[PDB]
Amino acid sequence: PMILGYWNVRGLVHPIRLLLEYTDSSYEEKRYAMGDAPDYDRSQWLNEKFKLGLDFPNLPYLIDGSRKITQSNAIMRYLARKHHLCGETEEERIRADIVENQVMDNRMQLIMLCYNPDFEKQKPEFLKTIPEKMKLYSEFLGKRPWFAGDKVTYVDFLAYDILDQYHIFEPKCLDAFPNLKDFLARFEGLKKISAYMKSSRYLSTPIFSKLAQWSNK
Template structure:
């Protein structure tokens, strides 16, 4: 498998985590966004329309003649290969719900991080995020994973968002014991633990050079 994305965590980090967890063999093609003031993206733009992608975008995944874009579509593709997309109709409904709810959460976080008014918007965002995280805490309850008895594709989206938010504000998770346990449970998965201890694991940057927060 070939995964293509900017040389940041961003929307590809959950995919990387899933590839590692499933022990898929993969390579990465990194694209660089230049520094201010131009933020040059020519490395990607020069090849964007010539890669045979139906809807050219990053991240992309190329495998066995299949060419996919969109984070959730890529996660589902990998997940289906490893029985990680639920079994029952109830599972599928919960996965569909979480796919979209987590992407809304991700989009809100991205808007904050890339806003020139980051410092002004941050306090209100923290309040809103606390409510959203509380709803996810209630949804998880005392279960180990979001859907079923083992990790599914949405757990990789969820973990990455929780990690990004505790980087944004360390106190955000502290009032939710089940989420603190969830994060540790995820990080203790043997293949995830080994990946995070390796020099291949990308701790930073969260966002691209144009971002106000997380570009370091």
Template sequence: MSKPVLGYWNIRGFAQPNRLLLKYLGVDYEDKRYYHGGPPDYSNDDWLQVKFSLGLDFPNIPYWIDDKVKLTESRAVFRYLARTYGPKLTPENEPLQAKSDMVEGFASDLQSALIQYSYTKVAPEEPIENALAPRFEQLSNFIGSNEWALGDKITYLDFYLYEVLYQFRKYNPDFFVPYPTLAKYLAKFEAIPQLTEYIKETEDLKCFSPTARIVF
């Protein structure tokens, strides 16, 4: 059996939750990172050289290839990895699974807002810290005194939620000063023994591509 491959740009973007999850689970895989050439000439992008030669049904990145599947779409890849390699990280029942899906969608909206803010050519008049304050208040209240996003047990959702919050903190190191619950959540995740060193090793990995207005 050949080693599984996770393919994505050489950035955090939509792939880092998968990398964190795989590291935590101790999965031996190839972390294939493609160079992003950027404007004005995208011909140097490594990904474009192989995009249509990997047998993917919907050629895109991130992708995951193992001996059973060839998958694209970030959420599909993430959930497949959780179910296949970390079944103990899945929510224990349907109500919790529904809550997990809800929070995952909420976090996805937050990340989309950060992406839009970072890539728009003209800086919005309202700082993103102000624009999203009500949503972060809601998230802080939702987690409350929980150990993890859904309660006392870590689930695959935490790997996605952590990365979204991390990207906001990387944009602004003081972003979570008004939200001590979320700051505590980040610190708790970063103290996981299987992840502490890996998180430090990947601190220099940019969140978004060189085409962003703000690169961090």
């Protein structure tokens, strides 16, 4: 089977775990453990980081026979191509490309805050910016069922993750945006997704590693 490697946290790998499930992919995971403070030992991963034949060793990685990939977006893309979940027109490609990158930005902004030792006093200032972030996603999606247009694409997997993440962070952040709540419901509604959510493999939290100030256990 295919081998997915990542930490034993949701981190940025949720869309991949979801995509593997949605596609009926035959895979096994290697969930690396991180030690507690103050050392935060990474040896389970460091012991093999340089022994897997990866070009640019990192987590996550996907081993698919002879093919070894790193970089989360590259992995999503690989699986999208294999299962025809890319945009089919130029307009769908452009929307998927923008979303792909936008999600990373919003992910980085959350990480910046969550790893700040000043988290508690920085928070109020971050909360302030949430409404604007959601509004842009809300207006982008508009009345479409999916982010690229009329059919699910890999970018829905990314968008779901980051919307879910913000909603965990600030549970009232989607109240003003019905289409976003609807989207989350629609996604969770997909048969293979609904099935996975009830499985032993499902890992919703923690989001971050033990070093974080929030969702770190």
